[PDB]
Design a protein around this ligand. Sequence first.
Ligand SMILES: NCCc1ccc(Cl)c(Cl)c1
Ligand SMILES: NCCc1ccc(Cl)c(Cl)c1
Ligand SMILES: NCCc1ccc(Cl)c(Cl)c1
Ligand SMILES: NCCc1ccc(Cl)c(Cl)c1
Ligand SMILES: NCCc1ccc(Cl)c(Cl)c1
Ligand SMILES: NCCc1ccc(Cl)c(Cl)c1
Length: 322
Amino acid sequence: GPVPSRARVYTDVNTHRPSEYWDYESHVVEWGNQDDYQLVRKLGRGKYSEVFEAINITNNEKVVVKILKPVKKKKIKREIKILENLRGGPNIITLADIVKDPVSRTPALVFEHVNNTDQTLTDYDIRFYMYEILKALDYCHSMGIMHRDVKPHNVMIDHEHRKLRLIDWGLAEFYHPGQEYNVRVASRYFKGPELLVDYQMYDYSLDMWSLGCMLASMIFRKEPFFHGHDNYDQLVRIAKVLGTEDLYDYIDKYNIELDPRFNDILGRHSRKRWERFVHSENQHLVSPEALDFLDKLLRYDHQSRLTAREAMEHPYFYTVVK
Ligand SMILES: NCCc1ccc(Cl)c(Cl)c1
Ligand SMILES: NCCc1ccc(Cl)c(Cl)c1
Ligand SMILES: NCCc1ccc(Cl)c(Cl)c1
Ligand SMILES: NCCc1ccc(Cl)c(Cl)c1
Ligand SMILES: NCCc1ccc(Cl)c(Cl)c1
Ligand SMILES: NCCc1ccc(Cl)c(Cl)c1
């Protein structure tokens, strides 16, 4: 069987908290009043959600309303409990209310309003915003929660106010050491190698891999950086950059049973130098410190990646106010 693993940090946060903190199935959800709100306009949609700008008619404040198709009720309870536990954390979206349609029983989450800013980014801007995301991740990991869906669309930035919010906690989960989790999390391009090789005993370090994918796409102007066309191909795209030598050493370290399908597609690939991705169009965003930081996030071995707190101490952030 596979070798067990434990987070290097915040290992026992949930172990030392009462069950009311992490037992989301027992959480008593209390509805607010859907009549306090009026929908203004549709902002976007997902397979099981619709997002609207709305106004709270009792105080004239704008809000964002996420209407959920309740296909998996336990999942909605988990998102609500996590949002309540994390409320007030640095750069964590604030859940303002929870309402239900009086006839269809469709639930809706009400968030603080955020004016999302859709080439003008400087090296300094990337360092600044990357540090704000790290504050959010160090906070949620310190609270015993893995986000598990870190990606650009889940990072809202109001650039005029230099305001950042980490959103969509629908895939977030409580970290319990030794627990085996579902690997069918995160968006394809941001999935860590642990998910792709079906290593279930993962932890907060998954979010640090996803953060590394975002950094690579920003500094190299290549969106997404690892462009897989399915979950198997996703690992091949990673292997084409990090090389196959370090991938095979990772699988052996954790005694992972690698799917036989990888034999026909993985091949043999050299370790590429991060400098290979630098071009005239992206050189203004790359520096030795940026590449050193990227190299310390994008590691196959989940235990070897920087933690959010270690990442915050990297020289890449020496130019930002802590
Ligand atoms: N009447 C169903 C649509 C809907 C959903 C959520 C809210 Cl908060 C509102 Cl006002 C309206
Ligand atoms: N996973 C949420 C993606 C997302 C982000 C921002 C907006 Cl405004 C919308 Cl509609 C949807
Ligand atoms: N939706 C904003 C995505 C994003 C994520 C990280 C950074 Cl550093 C930036 Cl500039 C932008
Ligand atoms: N996707 C769930 C979280 C979420 C989605 C979109 C927006 Cl605009 C906000 Cl505030 C929050
Ligand atoms: N400091 C970024 C510009 C630059 C110049 C030369 C090289 Cl080889 C690289 Cl990777 C990057
Ligand atoms: N990575 C391809 C070679 C290369 C390396 C560094 C720079 Cl700055 C350029 Cl333009 C081109």
